[PDB]
């Protein structure tokens, strides 16, 4: 069983250089993910010495 919290911090930046309609966008980010991961395993082995 695993329940994972993945917090995120982030910084972002863009720009678009043109003649007169030049556009820019610097930014950031914040995010989380509540990921509950289960895994069911069934295995075997046949050893002979």
């Amino acid at each position: 069983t695993s329940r994972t919290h993945t917090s995120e911090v982030h910084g972002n930046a863009e720009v678009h250089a043109s003649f007169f309609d030049i556009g820019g966008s610097v930014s950031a980010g914040f995010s989380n993910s509540n990921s509950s991961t289960v895994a069911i395993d069934h295995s075997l082995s046949l050893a002979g010495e």
């Binding site: 895994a39 069911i40 395993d41 069934h42 295995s43 075997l44 082995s45 046949l46 050893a47 002979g48 010495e49």
Partner: protein
């Protein structure tokens, strides 16, 4: 075999026996052992997830 000096009635005849040791052979009572062992193991497995 009675020596000729002791064949007079006044001289006694008698043996003088003594034992002298010439060697001593001691032998350590102790028991060794050795062993050699080969092996071959084949493992065949399976796993689901």
């Amino acid at each position: 075999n009675v020596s000729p000096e002791a064949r007079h009635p006044l001289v006694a005849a008698y043996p003088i026996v003594h034992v002298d040791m010439e060697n001593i052979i001691l032998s350590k009572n102790e028991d060794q052992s050795t062993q050699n062992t080969d092996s071959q193991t084949r493992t065949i497995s399976k796993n689901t997830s």
